[PDB]
């Protein structure tokens, strides 16, 4: 159902060519990116507190 809504929406509004939808994509692609980034930057920087065998 959600896909049906998306497709009819593209036909009737050309949502892809709408800059607010483009900001939305930038928002969710960027959100994913900075998530992967932040997660990875902090993780890469954990202080050594655990044995070579135990979870960090």
């Amino acid at each position: 159902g959600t896909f049906n809504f998306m497709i009819v929406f593209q036909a009737e509004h050309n949502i892809l060519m709408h800059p607010f939808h483009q900001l939305g994509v930038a928002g969710v692609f960027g959100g994913a990116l900075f998530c992967a980034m932040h997660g990875s930057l902090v993780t890469s920087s954990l202080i050594r507190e655990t044995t070579e065998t135990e979870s960090a």
């Binding site: 892809l16 969710v28 998530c35 992967a36 980034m37 930057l41 890469s44």
Partner: protein
């Protein structure tokens, strides 16, 4: 340090405004050529001979509609080297044949390799664990699957994504109509990873900012932080209680939380890549056979899944003749699927 190699290494790793490193000898020229190829093509280069399209500022396109378009289907998967047997060193002809496409795709591919090497190299010199590089494998799997694997499984590069805003949208709609890509469970995990990543980003940044300790007098709280300070700038304890009571569960372990922030969107993009590898072969998740058998036999059976396939068949019929010009499709008006009136 000793020999020429070690002297060069010294120079490459100097602490300057833009780090270079060994990875830089790969990274910098390939990133720069991919980008300048894009700006050059979108600015000056046509797609008339490959697609029957205008695609540059020179021809009247705007930012949303310019592209460096794929080569003509008749080019197959040719590397399309400037000096190859197609262009034979003729730069103008090369541009006209789609040479900038493979130029940007291959330089971009080697640039991406270079960037990830730069992430391994910097992390090794700063003495951190290389998680950022590892996270970047997700962008790599996406670029490689979509820009290389996909068109390599298909008839030619023509069917790769063309480098442009509107061109990429066309790519989206082609995937809906032809592959029913929204139905595909590998794309769905992709969506979960991307929207879950964005959710995790919003929710973590908002949680930190709203359980900050008062470490200053300023009503603007940004100044009340010190990079070298020993202590947490926000209360994990309060954050944990808040989410536990709001949502029912909360993080308690900050290392878990951050690892999870790496895991979700990275795994997402990896899953979408696997589905796109599938689509290289038309190995789609297109249909549910049990729905088709019931629908074939029972003309009163209808679901959203049947409704969306009628949309797809509209997309194929209506876009193919201009979207696939080398097929010379002529579809007389009477054959076009259409509902009442429209």
């Amino acid at each position: 340090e000793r020999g020429w190699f070690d002297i060069l290494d010294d120079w490459l790793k100097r602490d300057r405004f833009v780090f270079v490193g060994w990875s830089g000898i790969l990274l910098f020229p390939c990133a720069y050529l991919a980008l300048g190829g894009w700006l050059t093509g979108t600015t000056f280069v046509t797609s008339w001979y490959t697609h029957g399209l205008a695609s540059s500022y020179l021809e009247g396109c705007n930012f949303l509609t310019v592209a460096v378009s794929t080569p003509a289907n008749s080019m197959g998967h040719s590397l399309l080297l400037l000096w190859g047997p197609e262009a034979q060193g003729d730069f103008t002809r090369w541009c006209q044949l789609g040479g900038l496409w493979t130029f940007i795709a291959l330089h971009g591919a080697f640039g991406l390799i270079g960037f990830m090497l730069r992430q391994f190299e910097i992390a090794r010199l700063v003495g951190v664990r290389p998680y950022n590089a590892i996270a970047f494998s997700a962008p790599i799997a996406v670029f490689v699957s979509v820009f290389l694997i996909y068109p390599l499984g298909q008839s030619s590069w023509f069917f790769a994504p063309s480098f442009g805003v509107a061109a990429i949208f066309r790519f989206l709609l082609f995937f809906q109509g032809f592959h029913n890509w929204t139905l595909n469970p590998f794309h769905m995990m992709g969506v979960a990873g991307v929207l879950g990543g964005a959710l995790l980003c919003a929710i973590h940044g908002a949680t930190v900012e709203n359980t900050l300790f008062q470490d200053g007098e300023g009503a603007s709280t940004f100044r009340a932080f010190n990079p070298t300070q020993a202590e947490e700038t926000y209360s994990m304890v309060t954050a944990n209680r808040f989410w536990s009571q709001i949502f029912g569960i909360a993080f308690s372990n900050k290392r878990w939380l951050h690892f999870f922030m790496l895991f979700v969107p990275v795994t997402g993009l990896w899953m979408s890549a696997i589905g796109v590898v599938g689509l290289a072969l038309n190995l789609r998740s297109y249909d549910f056979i049990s729905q088709e058998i019931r629908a074939a036999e029972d003309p009163e059976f209808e679901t959203f899944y049947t409704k969306n396939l009628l949309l797809n068949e509209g997309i194929r019929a209506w876009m193919a003749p201009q979207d696939q010009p080398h097929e010379n499709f002529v579809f007389p008006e009477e054959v076009l699927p259409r509902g009442n009136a429209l």
